[PDB]
């Protein structure tokens, strides 16, 4: 059977399973990759928080939070605390274009979790609020 790049539909029954569970039952790792910080929260499919880790909660301060290594460490910490609650497979939902967009996922993988899908949910207004003016540096 040809691999489908598209995620499974909740309604349409599918045979894809991960440790016996359907796609819509897998825990979700929400990564928020800001410009100066990366925050990772693992939640259950029913939206029950299991683990949380940010670059600041891992000891990094000021500019050191906005690096790849800090996001990787936060990912490892989140993956460890999620492993301690029975999480193996995760669906990654990444929001933002910060330096830790990919390093947090790397840290999650090195912490033992298996990523089955990647979703981007970066906020894109259809021209709502007015952004701030450019910096005159």
């Amino acid at each position: 059977t040809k691999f489908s790049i598209y995620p499974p539909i909740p309604g349409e029954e599918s045979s894809l399973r991960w440790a016996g569970k359907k796609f819509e039952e897998i825990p979700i790792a929400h990564i928020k990759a800001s410009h100066n910080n990366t925050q990772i929260q693992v939640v259950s499919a029913s939206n029950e928080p299991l683990a949380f880790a940010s670059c600041g909660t891992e000891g990094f301060r000021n500019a050191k939070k906005g690096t790849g290594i800090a996001a990787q460490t936060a990912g490892i910490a989140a993956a460890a605390r999620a492993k301690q609650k029975g999480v193996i497979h995760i669906r990654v939902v990444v929001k933002g274009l910060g330096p830790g967009r990919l390093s947090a996922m790397h840290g999650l993988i090195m912490g033992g979790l298996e990523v089955i899908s990647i979703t981007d949910n970066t906020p894109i207004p259809h021209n709502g609020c007015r952004p701030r003016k450019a910096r005159k540096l």
Binding site: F3, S4, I5, Y6, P7, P10, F23, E24, R91, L97, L102, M105, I109, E114, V115, I116, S117, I118, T119, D120, N121, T122, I124, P125, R130, P131, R132, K133, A134, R135
Partner: protein
């Protein structure tokens, strides 16, 4: 917010190749124009500047395509000289 989740901007991992899935997602977001929109929305672009930028980009594309067409049309003559000496 009111839409179903895990349908938009979602990519499945093939045989644990997370890097390939991430790069495919980056390509999708780039060719759909979302990356440039996000980066251009960080600061407000004035309407006159926005219009000037779009006009410049459109005319740059047109000029580049015309130049490429001219070069490709004239490439056919670039072969070995059939009347060498004379």
């Amino acid at each position: 917010a009111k839409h179903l989740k895990f349908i938009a901007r979602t990519v499945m991992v093939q045989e644990g190749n997370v890097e390939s899935a991430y790069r495919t997602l980056n390509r999708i977001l780039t060719m759909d124009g979302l990356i440039e929109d996000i980066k251009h929305r960080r600061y407000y672009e004035k309407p006159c500047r926005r219009r000037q930028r779009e006009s410049y980009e459109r005319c740059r594309r047109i000029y580049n395509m015309e130049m490429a067409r001219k070069i490709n049309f004239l490439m056919r003559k670039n072969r070995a000289d059939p009347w060498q000496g004379c």
